[PDB]
Ligand binder design. Structure first.
Ligand SMILES: *[C@@H]1O[C@H](CO)[C@@H](O[C@@H]2O[C@H](CO)[C@@H](O[C@@H]3O[C@H](CO[C@@H]4O[C@H](CO)[C@@H](O)[C@H](O)[C@@H]4O)[C@@H](O)[C@H](O[C@@H]4O[C@H](CO)[C@@H](O)[C@H](O)[C@@H]4O)[C@@H]3O)[C@H](O)[C@H]2NC(C)=O)[C@H](O)[C@H]1NC(C)=O
Ligand SMILES: *[C@@H]1O[C@H](CO)[C@@H](O[C@@H]2O[C@H](CO)[C@@H](O[C@@H]3O[C@H](CO)[C@@H](O)[C@H](O)[C@@H]3O)[C@H](O)[C@H]2NC(C)=O)[C@H](O)[C@H]1NC(C)=O
Ligand SMILES: *[C@@H]1O[C@H](CO)[C@@H](O[C@@H]2O[C@H](CO)[C@@H](O[C@@H]3O[C@H](CO)[C@@H](O)[C@H](O)[C@@H]3O)[C@H](O)[C@H]2NC(C)=O)[C@H](O)[C@H]1NC(C)=O
Ligand SMILES: *[C@@H]1O[C@H](CO)[C@@H](O[C@@H]2O[C@H](CO)[C@@H](O[C@@H]3O[C@H](CO)[C@@H](O)[C@H](O)[C@@H]3O)[C@H](O)[C@H]2NC(C)=O)[C@H](O)[C@H]1NC(C)=O
Ligand SMILES: *[C@@H]1O[C@H](CO)[C@@H](O[C@@H]2O[C@H](CO)[C@@H](O[C@@H]3O[C@H](CO)[C@@H](O)[C@H](O)[C@@H]3O)[C@H](O)[C@H]2NC(C)=O)[C@H](O)[C@H]1NC(C)=O
Ligand SMILES: *[C@@H]1O[C@H](CO)[C@@H](O[C@@H]2O[C@H](CO)[C@@H](O)[C@H](O)[C@H]2NC(C)=O)[C@H](O)[C@H]1NC(C)=O
Ligand SMILES: *[C@@H]1O[C@H](CO)[C@@H](O)[C@H](O)[C@H]1NC(C)=O
Length: 1323
């Protein structure tokens, strides 16, 4: 409406429409003394063929509506209808505009090469093309205002802006920068338009990003507290190397002052085991590493990790690496190196950082993306809604037709394939001569069947008609390329014809049900999907070519700061590297690039790989979840019976009861809590050896009675029946076997007795939340295993591909200490086996299908897929040796995998898990009848109204001038200004470097002294004022402790420490105050809007927190009795083992997010060495666990990284959707709170009334939309406001009346009666 009004005004008012370009015609507004072709209204045709065209255009417009016109608007100064006008007309019309795009696409193909041809001459061409074009557009429209409008309308912003700089670049200073080359390429962001609709998504990401601007102001604070924490805990913790002491009475030193600081400073003796290029962080808080013997562990000695840029000291680095954590990225180092350093207690920090920041604040962005995406599609549905509304031969033929119809044919068809699928499904490297010949026989047999089935159908029914069915068209395309296949391999050459065998595999979709369904919905977005796709490449391409010319000539020139290497594998030299390195950062690892970039490239790289992360991953790759979500929304007869009643009242009586029931649950806990402290060290000196064995017997004594009393009490028929009572019977089974082997026998079957842990489940669902989350898991799992059947399927395609070209390779020559030699000594399996030595494999190969399958999953979840992908590049024949650079075009094989694997399927687990979780909230709280999303809003408002009664208003004790104190405690001066002090106290901590002069130390000591005195005043003025309402007041309790500890700290003095304080918690409690601010944010109301959200979720969000704690505790104990001694090589550093119960959780929180599960897998799949465990005197158990691993990690990553950690996401995006939902319609919770705030003001003594005369003021004292501003008497008098004598009004009459107003002030129509009905019901 507003837009329309604006348009009308311009038609009026003081803009001019110069031309309207419509359907290849430029129709011509002029000049209020002067014309050209004003009329008709109506489909006339006054003049002319031009006239006719105009008429046609008009007609089209009337049909259509707005669509589509190109408006050039005008005055302004000059130009009536010769030369400028003509020019304008030319520009309006569209094939020219098609031109400039081309010269745009021509630059892209020209820029992507290298430098090569120096046509700078051809470079000079395209500028002059655009120099003309910069001229046409400013000539069309006008003059100084419209260069001011040419600034203005913003796609055009980029055509001027960039091309001045492209004009600048001819200008020559070769002085300073070559940044002129930098921003040249941005031109190609035009090319989005091309392709077709273009508009929800470009307009998605535009509405995606400028809503997130609010939210960014959150996390820029959100990071800034924790990087402080890291600064303040972790400062120069992350430099503990391990240094020797002395030759004591030896050779070096005496007086240990200027030489002990010298003998430790030299980087020649501190510990390295075997060239692990960096330096091996140590510890000496117990548990946390250490470090081998004759040593000790010092802090401040040279360097720090990856390339000097990990550590938490010096604030600005502490920002980057903490922001690493919120990304959840390669932290497998920054995990471990910290715990080698400090201790195994500091995951309690890393839970905060990862749990609180990056499990919230990466969802909060997805929250914004999906909301902004849905808001534009429903906006785009309005266009979608409006535009819609001989005899023998004959007999034979008949027979053929019959067989086509039959239950015969498709069956045997679907047989032949599930068999043919199986023939391609072997393709070994070894593949015995007889096996090879079998396989070759397989296809000539099976290819003929295809032609026959195909040759007969076409003949059985109707040629021209036969090509109506696309599947039969698809069926025909098989055997055309099948008969292609055969000739090449008669003929002799070549190669790629073979993989069109894999086009067969698709034939299966028609025979499926679930899969024709799945393939069908994407045939809904042949468009939306590929449009989303096209920008993802474009944005990335935009960053690819700016990366090359920008970082660029640094990799080749410097060349030597790298770890004694010439170039790394992920550089910025050509396009394909510089496309791959930017794509690597999109999926998201982006540090190891950005070490590698900044090490050599000085500064400017830091903005670039954060700009590829936000704009790349959190904006695009969360958008691609919103695409899948909006598309895939789919006497003894009585006496024994009296005993049978006595057993019914023994059991059914005793059974419902809490007091036994909790007695069972408590026991399962402390029995399983005993089960934690088992292993390696049980045989420690056998107090637990014995009780773990007592608890063994006396548990099974409790489980067999458990089983009687449940057996008889509830239900014979339905006890043997259902699932959670199955898991009991099977425990009781299971502990029955062990007794069975205490005498007649003997061993403990260990794993039988570990299904005791399995029953802790159903205390857990009962807990005061998980009822929601549980119901959403065990419901999920049917639809999950529907996706998975699918997700096999595409991987099944991609795998057997990679066998047909990958299989056989991955066999590099190696001397025993692992060195790929290089070349020239190597290049076949002869010259490495003819010398003597060891032509050996890489552990994640593509030899089999299951070997190729698992090794594809490492590139699925982006772990260890650098390490595959280098070897994959390098390999170039079956029995020859792989070389470092060659065969790099098939590094694009992964890109056609990683899209159709990782973003389209691995994130499709999210678009199941959100669709289920909205429904389970409906069956908690709600219904399924409303279903149109408004009635439910109304009901929730009604329930919110019914809720609150009032504050007390902590109302005064009397005096001395104690009264003063409460005149300042509640004031709006003191809370700001004392709070303002807390933000001051923060920024103190922000200044601090490592070890820093005393000069700085004296200052911070001085300033810390100041602030606590003011705080000590804050406390007692706060204390004397409210006193007990202090402690109903959460922050102040915290605000109280840090004060008290400060007096503990600084006051008496110390002596000694520990025995109270020490410096961790003192500073921790000081930082925890700064979260007082979320109270104070109420300013711009989109950001307090979303944080109300967070609390609405946190209690269900803690609940999911517990399952993750739990199925950790599950799989640690269950793995632990699997994963006793197993070497170590390569991510169980002999501190991060499955040995104890501590590290088994330290391990698995790494695996929780699935960061570093390859190198973990590589240990538990390591089969080389072993001394076979004898179960005798002796054994070194340190041996192996293949099948015991695959069925563990894959059973972990599906459970943790797929469902439950995305279940984490489904909670936040439900609630944050619900909240913007209310706000749109509606009435958030903030509003209700502010109402009672101001109600308290007017009703201090919580009488729950208010006087007649004060009502008007109360209606004035509210925030919109509840607020009825003065004058308001005539409006109030409108609402139903009953008064009790004498002239008092009750609150909820007021609440009801006021809230009923607002939905009025919102709306009209039919909701309202619904609302009324709801109210009535409530009453
Ligand atoms: C746990 O880990 C911590 C580190 O986080 C270890 O702490 C280290 O402990 C070492 C002893 O076990 C300390 O060595 C001492 O360090 C003194 C440092 O000297 C100062 O240097 C400044 C710099 O200019 C000088 O101005 C000062 O004047 C100091 O001299 C050595 O001087 C000291 O040498 C001894 O001194 C005594 C007198 O006190 C002599 O009689 C004796 O003959 C010997 O020369 C001594 O070597 C080390 O500094 C300390 N780390 C830090 C960063 O301070 C813990 O030891 C670890 N836990 C365990 C149980 O080992
Ligand atoms: C640990 O102490 C030793 C000596 O106890 C230090 O050795 C120093 O080694 C340097 C070699 O680089 C010697 O170089 C001298 O430098 C000056 C100025 O560059 C020059 O004029 C001399 O002709 C000579 O080249 C130096 O003599 C020697 N120091 C002493 C006191 O003799 C070593 O540097 C110490 N380690 C660390 C990490 O400081
Ligand atoms: C760090 O420690 C290493 C050894 O732990 C030091 O290397 C040593 O450097 C000294 C000179 O400072 C060398 O002494 C020289 O010996 C040769 C004969 O071998 C003689 O021709 C010279 O006149 C001089 O005396 C010593 O050989 C060398 N040893 C080793 C094993 O490398 C290094 O200097 C230390 N650096 C710092 C900064 O402390
Ligand atoms: C195992 O890996 C390392 C390379 O990463 C190599 O170990 C080195 O092996 C040599 C003997 O082959 C050790 O002895 C050295 O021999 C040279 C003469 O060639 C002599 O000048 C030295 O004083 C020393 O005696 C050498 O210490 C050792 N390196 C280390 C750091 O311990 C080796 O190439 C690999 N093994 C095989 C079989 O290739
Ligand atoms: C590494 O490969 C070389 C060959 O490239 C192997 O050397 C060969 O070793 C065998 C037995 O050790 C030698 O055969 C016998 O040698 C004795 C002399 O000791 C001779 O009297 C016999 O008549 C018989 O020929 C063979 O000559 C020798 N060849 C060469 C060229 O040295 C070696 O065994 C391989 N080592 C490993 C660890 O694989
Ligand atoms: C470390 O330095 C001290 C410096 O005093 C050495 O002590 C001297 O040692 C010599 C012989 O080694 C004696 O003749 C002196 O009398 C000692 N000085 C004193 C004050 O007693 C000490 O020997 C040195 N340590 C080593 C291992 O050489
Ligand atoms: C290469 O390997 C084949 C394997 O049969 C062998 O016969 C041949 O002699 C080898 N050639 C060289 C040059 O080592």
């Amino acid at each position: 409406d507003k837009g329309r009004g604006a348009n009308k005004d311009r038609d009026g008012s003081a803009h001019p429409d110069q031309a309207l370009e419509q359907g290849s015609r430029l129709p011509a507004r002029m000049r209020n003394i002067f014309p050209a072709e004003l009329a008709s209204t109506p489909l006339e045709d006054f003049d002319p063929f031009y006239k006719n065209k105009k008429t046609f255009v008009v007609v089209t417009k009337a049909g259509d509506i707005f669509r589509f016109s190109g408006e050039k608007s005008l005055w302004m100064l000059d130009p009536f209808t010769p030369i400028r006008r003509v020019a304008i007309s030319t520009m309006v019309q569209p094939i020219f505009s098609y031109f400039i795009m081309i010269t745009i696409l021509i630059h892209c193909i020209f820029m992507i090469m290298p430098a090569t041809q120096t046509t700078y001459i051809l470079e000079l061409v395209f500028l002059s093309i655009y120099t003309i074009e910069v001229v046409v557009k400013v000539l069309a429209r006008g003059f100084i205002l419209h260069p001011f409008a040419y600034l203005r309308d913003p796609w055009n912003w980029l055509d001027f802006l960039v091309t001045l700089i492209g004009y600048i670049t001819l200008v020559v200073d070769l002085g300073h920068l070559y940044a002129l080359r930098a921003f040249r390429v941005l031109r190609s962001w035009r090319t989005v338009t091309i392709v077709p609709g273009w508009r929800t998504i470009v307009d998605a990401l535009s509405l995606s990003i400028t809503s997130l601007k609010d939210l960014v102001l959150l996390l820029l604070f959100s990071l800034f507290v924790f990087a402080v924490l890291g600064l303040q805990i972790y400062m120069g913790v992350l430099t503990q190397k391990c240094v020797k002491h002395f030759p004591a009475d030896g050779s070096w030193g005496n007086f240990t002052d200027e030489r002990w600081f010298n003998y430790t400073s030299n980087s020649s003796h501190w510990y390295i085991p075997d060239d692990w290029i960096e330096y091996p962080l140590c510890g000496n808080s117990s548990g946390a590493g250490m470090c081998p013997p004759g040593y000790t562990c010092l802090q401040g000695y040279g360097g720090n990790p990856n390339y000097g840029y990990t550590s938490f000291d010096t604030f600005g680095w502490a920002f980057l690496s903490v922001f690493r954590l919120v990304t959840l990225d390669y932290w497998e180092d920054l995990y471990q190196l910290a715990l080698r350093s400090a201790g195994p207690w500091h995951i309690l920090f890393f839970i905060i950082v990862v749990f609180y920041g990056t499990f919230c604040f990466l969802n909060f962005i997805l929250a914004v993306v999906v909301m902004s995406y849905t808001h534009m599609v429903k906006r785009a549905d309005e266009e979608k809604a409006a535009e819609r509304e001989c005899v023998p031969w004959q007999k034979l033929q008949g027979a053929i037709g019959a067989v086509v119809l039959s239950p015969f044919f498709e069956l045997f068809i679907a047989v032949i394939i599930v068999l043919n699928i199986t023939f391609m499904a072997l393709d070994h490297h070894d593949m015995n001569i007889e096996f090879e010949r079998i396989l070759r026989t397989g296809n000539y047999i099976f290819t003929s069947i295809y032609i026959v089935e195909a040759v007969l159908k076409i003949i059985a029914l109707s040629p021209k008609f036969y090509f109506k069915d696309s599947w039969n068209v698809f069926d025909f395309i098989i055997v055309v390329f099948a008969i292609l296949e055969l000739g090449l391999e008669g003929v002799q050459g070549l190669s790629v014809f073979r993989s069109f065998r894999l086009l067969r595999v698709f034939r299966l979709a028609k025979f499926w049900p679930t899969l024709n369904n799945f393939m069908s919905v994407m045939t809904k977005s042949y468009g939306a999907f590929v449009n989303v796709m096209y920008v993802m490449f474009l944005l990335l391409f935009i960053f690819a070519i700016i990366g090359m010319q920008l970082f660029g000539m640094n990799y080749i020139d410097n060349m030597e700061r790298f770890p004694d290497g010439d170039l790394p594998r992920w550089n910025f030299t050509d396009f394909l590297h510089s496309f791959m390195i930017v794509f690597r950062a999109l999926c998201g690892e982006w540090i190891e690039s950005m070490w590698d970039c900044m090490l050599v490239g000085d500064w400017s790289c830091i903005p670039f790989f954060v700009a590829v992360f936000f704009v790349g991953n959190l904006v695009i790759l969360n958008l691609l979840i919103a695409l899948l979500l909006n598309n895939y929304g789919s006497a003894r007869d009585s006496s024994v019976q009296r005993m049978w009643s006595n057993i019914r009242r023994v059991c059914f009586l005793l059974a419902k009861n809490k007091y036994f029931q909790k007695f069972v649950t408590a026991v399962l806990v402390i029995t399983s809590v005993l089960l934690a402290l088992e292993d390696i060290y049980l045989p420690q000196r056998p107090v637990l050896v014995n009780i773990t064995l007592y608890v063994d017997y006396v548990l099974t004594a409790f489980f067999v009675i458990e089983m009687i009393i449940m057996l008889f009490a509830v239900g014979f028929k339905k006890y043997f029946t259902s699932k959670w009572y199955w898991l009991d019977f099977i425990v009781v089974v299971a502990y029955l076997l062990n007794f069975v082997l205490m005498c007649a026998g003997i061993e403990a079957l260990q794993t039988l007795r570990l299904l005791r842990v399995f029953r802790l489940f159903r205390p857990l669902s009962k807990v005061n939340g998980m009822q929601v989350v549980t119901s959403t898991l065990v419901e999920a799992v049917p639809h999950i295993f529907n996706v998975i059947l699918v997700g096999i399927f595409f991987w099944l395609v991609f795998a057997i591909m990679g066998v047909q070209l990958f299989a056989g390779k991955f066999y590099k020559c190696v001397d025993e200490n692992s060195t790929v030699l290089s070349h020239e000594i190597t290049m076949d399996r002869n010259d490495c086996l003819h010398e003597n030595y060891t032509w050996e494999n890489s552990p994640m190969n593509f030899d089999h299908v299951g070997n190729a399958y698992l090794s594809l999953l490492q590139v699925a979840t982006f772990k260890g897929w650098l390490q595959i992908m280098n070897d994959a590049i390098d390999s170039r024949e079956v029995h020859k040796q792989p070389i470092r650079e060659t065969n790099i075009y098939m590094y694009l094989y992964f890109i056609f995998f990683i899209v159709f694997g990782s973003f389209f399927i691995l994130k499709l687990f999210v678009c199941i898990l959100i669709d289920i979780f909205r429904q389970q909230r409906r069956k908690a709280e709600g219904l399924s009848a409303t279903d149109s999303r408004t009635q439910l809003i109304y009901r929730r408002a009604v329930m919110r109204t019914m809720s609150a009664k009032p504050v007390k208003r902590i109302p005064k004790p009397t005096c001395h001038p104690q009264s003063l104190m409460y005149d300042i405690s509640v004031n709006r001066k003191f809370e700001y200004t004392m709070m303002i002090l807390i933000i001051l106290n923060v920024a103190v901590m922000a200044i601090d470097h490592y070890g820093q002069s005393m000069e700085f130390s004296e200052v911070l000591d001085y300033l810390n002294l100041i602030f606590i005195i003011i705080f000590f005043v804050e406390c007692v003025i706060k204390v004397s004022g409210l006193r007990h309402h202090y402690f109903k007041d959460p922050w102040n309790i915290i605000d109280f402790l840090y004060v008290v500890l400060a007096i503990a700290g600084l006051m008496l003095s110390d002596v000694i420490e520990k025995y109270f304080i020490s410096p961790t918690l003192l500073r921790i409690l000081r930082i925890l105050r700064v979260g007082r601010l979320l109270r104070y944010f109420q300013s711009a109301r989109g950001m307090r809007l979303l944080l109300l959200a967070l609390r609405k979720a946190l209690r269900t969000l803690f609940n999911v927190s517990f399952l993750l704690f739990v199925i950790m505790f599950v799989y640690a104990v269950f793995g632990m009795e699997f994963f006793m001694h197993i070497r170590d090589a390569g991510a169980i550093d002999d501190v991060y083992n499955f040995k104890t119960f501590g590290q088994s959780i330290i391990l698995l929180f790494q695996l929780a997010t699935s960061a570093g599960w390859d190198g973990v897998y590589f240990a538990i799949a390591n089969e080389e060495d072993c001394r076979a465990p004898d179960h005798e005197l002796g054994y070194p158990g340190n041996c192996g666990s293949r099948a015991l691993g695959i069925a563990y990690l894959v059973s972990y990553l599906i459970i943790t990284c797929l469902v439950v950690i995305n279940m984490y996401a489904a909670v936040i995006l439900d609630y944050v959707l619900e909240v913007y939902e209310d706000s749109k319609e509606g009435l958030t919770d903030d509003d209700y709170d502010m109402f009672f705030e101001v109600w308290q003001q007017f009703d201090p003594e919580a009488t729950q009334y208010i006087r007649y005369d004060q009502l008007s003021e109360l209606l004035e004292a509210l925030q919109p939309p509840l607020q009825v501003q003065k004058p308001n008497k005539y409006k109030i008098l409108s609402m139903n406001i009953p008064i009790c004598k004498d002239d008092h009004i009750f609150y909820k009459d007021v609440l009801e009346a006021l809230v009923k107003d607002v939905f009025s002030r919102r709306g009209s129509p039919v909701e309202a009666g619904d609302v009324q009905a709801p109210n009535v019901d409530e009453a």
